[model samples]
Target: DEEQLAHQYETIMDECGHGRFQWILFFVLGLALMADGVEVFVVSFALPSAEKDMCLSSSKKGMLGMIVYLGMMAGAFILGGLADKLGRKRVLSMSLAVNASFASLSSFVQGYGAFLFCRLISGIGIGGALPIVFAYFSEFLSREKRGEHLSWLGIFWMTGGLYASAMAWSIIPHYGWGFSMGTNYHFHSWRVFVIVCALPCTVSMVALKFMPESPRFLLEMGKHDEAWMILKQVHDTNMRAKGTPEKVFTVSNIKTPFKTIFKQVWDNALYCVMGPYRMNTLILAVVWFAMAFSYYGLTVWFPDMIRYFQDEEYKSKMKVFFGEHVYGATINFTMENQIHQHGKLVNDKFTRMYFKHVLFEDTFFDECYFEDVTSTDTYFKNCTIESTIFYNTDLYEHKFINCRFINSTFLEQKEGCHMDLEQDNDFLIYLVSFLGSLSVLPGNIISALLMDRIGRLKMIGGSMLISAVCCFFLFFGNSESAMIGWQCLFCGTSIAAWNALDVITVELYPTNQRATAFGILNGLCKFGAILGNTIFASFVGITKVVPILLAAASLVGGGLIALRLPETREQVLM
Candidate 1:
């Protein structure tokens, strides 16, 4: 009787195809993804302004970035485990509320120290949201559509970056930076962003009111009746037009303790990484680390480098007109052909002749040239002019005009390349990062498409080799001209490799330990982010070359690890 009932449920599910309810459920999970994306990028955007308002030092700035990842690491490990033990749906819904509240609280911080603390706390909430959301989405999706759905999820995540940039532009300038926090002491602008993020959670919470829990989860819990009811609900929703409800219920003596379930999970884990399934985990981890480091590093520092280059161009102009010592107030002086006792300008002619010495103090210079003056000529000091030149030597012409250079030493000193945040050029770094991120999309899609066609082990190995090559090239190609393109290429390839790895990992592990396995992987990945932060923040100050080399070395090492695993494609669960 139990076997017959189980067969009936499967038949119904096949007809319904994941059910309308699960689609809606997955849509709600996308909101969770959006919230995570917003939280992650908002800090990157807000950090500049926050640093200015709080007077953060270089070390503090680095810590601010590191804290968020650290919190995420803690959250993934703790909350991921909880999700497995308690339940994915309940934990996911509860986490939305927590994520919003803490993210809002972060905006109320009054000092640099406080702000860092808030970010760290917020990280904990954000951390749990990603894996659980992915787990939920992945579980409900069909195998054929899983990669496409996950890729779509990735698109939504990228959209969050756009939304965050928009919010920062709309509110940060006129209201003063503090406006990110709303009035009620609880609802800041940053808080508003968090609340906006939470809106999806609210919607999901309400939707779950009518939604049935996961039938798979119910089966695992040994609640055969409840699982049957939930499966019936799915079937009912699908067969509403037919006006006939099918009854599918079963009772089984196949009872397994929760401990036994965990033991199964542990056995799968060992086999997946060290047994036939080992290649997938190793390949995925490498890809993930490479993608994270390249993507994040470029996002954080590209703007800084552009600004620095622009400043250098401006300073060169200044040196050209100032004759190395042209200082003091501008005074009107006529040209006089008189020799000086010392090499200094004793006569106006010598001063006037020295066109290069006529520094344009705060005034713009369109064009000025020392036509007949020489460093060795006495008359070179006699040339002088009271006239000021104002030319648009805005050497940094490509900069976005409305883009405000906030919170750095430049902002503190009230100077730097200014541009509109909305301008395309202003987002060069983000564009590059997105390109790198987008690379993973195809990788993910192709891997998913090919998983059943090509073996998982071969794909995993091939991806690792591609990623390793890309990383090696990126590391060796660290020149200014090559870094941007190389980084983007490396990022895209790495993402593809990682996505393949992710799919395989999901297949290798049992449903019971899936969340825990995801948590562990994500947690280790955060450590990779920290490794990047440490290298760039502390060691990069010494030399830029070291970090890139380290990143490349890590990728190569990860690829080597990928070579040792056995194939798991088409392998059935024991």
Candidate 2:
């Protein structure tokens, strides 16, 4: 009756059902992902100061982002599969500790080399555990509730990002000694922010200590006694309101040979895209790649680009303003006291405005802006003029002894970015960061709430389409009003797609290959992140069109491919 027992174990796995017990597991999985989000989100925020203090070269700057993915790619392959062989809780717990320790250690690093080392190791740990969270969570729930539950798990990923950005706004702008936190070392605000990112990992480790392992894995391994204990615990918790039942779990005595289990891990990758899963698996690969590429690529660009341009825009406007308004107070002076007779012959308001190839003499003049106008040999004495715009216009012999210019677009283009990083621009940084972080929450909520009812494919497909339109707008450029409006839609829709799509990935494969499939998807996702970061680093010059269009194209392309995917609504995880 080994086969009968095996069927019984599989059915027993589903009977554990949803309860406080499962909810507890969900929270733990959520927390683990939250920590992952923090690690991923904070790097871009810290780079400006981190690179500045470390004196990183342009190439090193790019490499810093690239190395994390290399490490994650490695982790995803090895650790991801290890979870299938070992239990989920054990592997996940160990990986959490690995990431937490490394991420925490990264805060105290002294140079770019050390920081890079920290990021690589952190990536490995993070990569190893991410897939297991989904695979483990899905296996615990019944088919009816798995999709909805997985959708809820997406919340933590976004929340973690919001927390990182919020803290980046708060912590990145303030600095002090670390003595109170039990460390006397001095560091910048960005370093402190890195430390905060690691806390979730520590918490997850604690949570995992108390959490149950995947019962299905134990049953598959023929650990009937071990699987029975877990199922009994879940059954008791779930049967609390309804009255208890016995014989809820019965596992098989015949296990796959240890060698076969080992071989299973070896061929896990080939299993995903071969046989019945081949076509869908390939399509999912494309969707995952495109989704990750666009998401990480554009998201990495947001805070840095906005913050960078916002700062420079302020300087340019202020510089022109001060130049115009900074004219010496107009004074009364007579040239040799030469006043011709007859009513002190005074030419009311001498027309110094109209001299071709003339220098407008700085004396005293009203506040004004001159655009596409040339000032020449015409010199006004004792005249003060306020801000002026001579953009692409000739300032011929114009000499202002005492003058100021505001909102003036100068003919000269800056050879480099004109921003003072050390200055205090707290309000602007936080404003942009806070608003953007706030905007992303709605998508998660909407997707979580509506995903089960609407079916996975359409909700996700519609979201990607919405995001695709926003991507187009971002590519073409828009007024601030248009951009901000699209910004919300962009934030909401993109995340909404991800939230629904994650559930699909969680349910796409059978139990035997679920973790392996998720591992590959996770690897591909990180690989996409690597590609995005690398492209951004290398083509830093090609800012607007190439990346935005590339992202939009990927997003839409992914949407189309995703629509082709099966709508796994109310479908049980096999």
Candidate 3:
């Protein structure tokens, strides 16, 4: 009788493993990721057009950027904790619908005030979705694939950026800036951008209608039979797909309460700093703060920088091409070529001269030169100049000939521009604006690599020390010259520290609590962003030293806090 019962259990497992439901879940989760990615990056692309249509002031534009992050902060804290209590699928679906609705409704904003409010609300929804998606994905996948899968999610984010760029290119040009559907209230072009951004969320919300609640979440909630059934489904589907017989699986009695979970996290947090982990979380947080500060600072200012660089390059080219003495039709033709070359030069020159030299010097400018050139006399008949070196018509041609040399010199000088550490250091200051921003990727990657090895604590502590040391170097390094190398070093170290922190936050909490934790962390990080943005906008021109000093101080404080966390390396989920 016992053997027969075992056989029956084996048969049941086989059926469960072959079930088709698992594939559906995978598709649903992928859809969720797509939605989350779109929401996060849409604003980044839409802001330029939105700002134009609304006539937003510089300060207001900064506020708009910060607001979305702030909303995300709040959403993560509130929704993440709530999901832990309410159930993963329930919260996931609800947040998706809510986020979609808010995003869709954002199209109705008529002014800066309304638009800001909508963004804040939309941020809440977006914030809630990110961590939950992370938690949901973690729960649904196999253990070995977790990191790889999570990293792949970054691709979704990349896709989102692409999507936003596509939308901006399509909608802003033809539609005139706003998107409205009703006759009673005509929607502006920016509003239409918002609406288009919201479309993905709406689609996700509908697809989520069929997504099942995570079985692990159900088990945590003490719905043992339900979890068992869901597990059976997972097994059946997997086995059938592989053409293998299913085996019966049993649930362990490891039910934990929300309070208990919090207590464990607190304990882990304490141990992480003092026992084995040591100051990792704090290090991570500081790193995150710095990364956020640097990344947004540069990214938000990118278009402006591009525009500025293009203008500068054009002006410089014009001066050289036409010489100090040329005028009339000659000047016009020379300027036109300069303008024509502006786009290509900006795009190719920066890479060819800098990145190529830095990464692959030999191949850098081997085949990179203007494909076509036209002389001033070919297009202009009445052109003439003075007899001086500047007046020589050949001098204009000579300037064009020397552009390659000029470009090489400019690239070399520009590289040093980031290193200027003197009292009258405008270039260094501009470079510092991006110091915190560029750290994110390296920070994230380093943290991820070490998360499972040395544990979160040591990684965080070490990162903190590195970040603080770099800060001190930046603050007290020689001021007679620019310290571009030091600035890059500072950013690279800070990013390593912060990315580890992001991973730690995601790992410390269980699937159910993941969203809330992420929300809280993202929100807190945004506060730092707000402070940085506000200071740069308000006090940068007035008191530049203060902001730089403040940035250094924050890194030190954040490093100190990191020293207090416990190691969370290879910790078992509660």
Candidate 4:
């Protein structure tokens, strides 16, 4: 009976084809996924600005970052299972409404407690909406097209990230967009960014209400006629658009009701963890947890990474060298004829010193940033120049006798070399994040093209292995370009792994437990995300290497663990 029903549904789905209706559904559901991306990532951009306004402590900041995932975890745990017992369309609509409303409200709230409360509620909405969107959308696609279409859906997640990054780049960095709210509190640009971020979820919620319910879900619920009608509508919509003659739909009614004996949601949940799905569920849990841990860890900390680099490269050390914030400061002092011979200047720190047309013989210059200096006939005898930045100074013009230049940076100004420390730092951070999200586009294309051909297990395992390598390389990356390059590589390969994970996870479960399984997996992954963020938030200031190494270790571990699962390419859902 199960085989007969599955065959009938497959035949009808094949006839319907991937056309206008499915594409429309794809766009709508994809918007919901994009909204999840924006809501999650926009906070990374907003956090720095919000900290100044709210006076948020480090623990509070970590808590604020963690609060959403906590809400998502709960929402996925509760609402995901409810979708199976209630309905996909209803729970989806409800989740979107909750997310949009609370997220919108969160923008207006003051104080840490109120903002935290609003975000948590909104997060629940996002958590439930994210997994259900995939479940609902994938049910409509034919088995042959399912993996590819899901990869297309994964593309929206990256699009959402790009959208959030662009919005933050445009809005949050500006100062004039904010207004004062009397004396106690002031509305900021980041608050406006948050409001704008909520707009997509609002639009998605409205659009989802008008969309048709999944026919597969309906059939599982014993609404055979409704499923038949939806299938017929899909067939008609596709045929009309293609300008092809529509064949008469002749699929028989599905008699075997999914989960007929399992009356409660717990039954479906237990069926996943305690029955035939036990091993698959356990393995997938590890993979999902590791993916979320590494992906969110880097994404949320990308801004911090850039800041850390800037501090190490110039900012903090430059303050000592330049006497103050040197981003807008100038150092152009010229001494025409200064003669200081046989000067013993050991352990003397020079700040913004310009020695031009100077003759200093037998001088010990140590730990100095000698800027805008013309070293004319400067002779160092029995001197050690250690840890000094000789900026715009002619070193070849001077003669060194028993002198050693140790751990010093020599900088020269070229014709077109303009340096703006503050602006460059901000631009690099935002641009790298934008690139990280953009990298996922190519990853999706790779997954879509090779997923079915290579099989789901191979795609997940291989992409994860590559991503693991990227993360491992990131640990050794100290320069801007190196870190950014490794970050983009990790993003691309990890997202491809994610695309495969999304396809295989849905294929492994039946309609009755599909949403529930997604919810469980998402819940566990969010828990991993929470742990990642917390560990990163706590440890990033102390050491960046540990978090990155942990991420790499988890990816390699998870990749190997994922290989144990059976391939589910083109498998029909029960």
Which candidate order results from sorting by lDDT in descending order? 4, 2, 1, 3
What are the RMSDs of all candidates, in order? Answer: 10.5, 11.3, 14.9, 11.1
Tell me the lDDT of model 1 at 69.
84
Flag regions of model 4 displaced more than 4 Å: 53-60, 174-187, 258-263, 315-428
- lDDT per residue as tens, model 2, 1-574: 4445445544665666677687788888888888777767554434444233211111214555467777777777777777777777887888888898888887776665777788888878888888889888877776555566777777787678778868876776531112222233543555667787877788889988888888778767666677668777888777775565544534334343246755768787687788878988898889989989887777655544554555345434421111233333322221111111112111222221222222233333333443333332223333444444444334432344445543434673322111123223333434454566577777877777787767888887798888888888776553433445556678778887777777887777766677777787888998899788667444444456787788888988999888888878655455
| Residue 560, model 1, lDDT | 63
What TM-score would every model get versus the actual structure? 0.67, 0.73, 0.57, 0.77
Which residue ranges in model 2 land beyond 4 Å of their true spot?
A: 1-14, 50-60, 174-184, 241-264, 308-312, 315-434, 475-477, 480-484, 536-543
User: How far out, in Å, is residue 59 in model 4?
Assistant: 10
What range of 10 consecutive residues in model 3 has the weakest lDDT sum?
354-363
Cα misplacement distance, residue 251 of candidate 2 (Å): 10
RMSD of 4: 11.1
Residues 140-215 of candidate 1: C-alpha lDDT, one tens digit per residue: 5455444444544555565555556555444442112442433454314444544554454456556655555556
Query: Global CA lDDT of candidate 2, please?
Result: 0.65
- Candidate lDDT scores, in order, read 0.51, 0.65, 0.48, 0.72
Tens-place lDDT digits, model 4, residues 86-132: 88889988998998888878677655567778888888998898889
The window of 10 residues in a row where model 1 has the poorest summed lDDT is 406-415
Query: Per-residue alpha-carbon lDDT of model 3 for 431-450, expressed as tens digits?
Result: 33334234334554654565
**TM match of model 4 to true structure:** 0.77
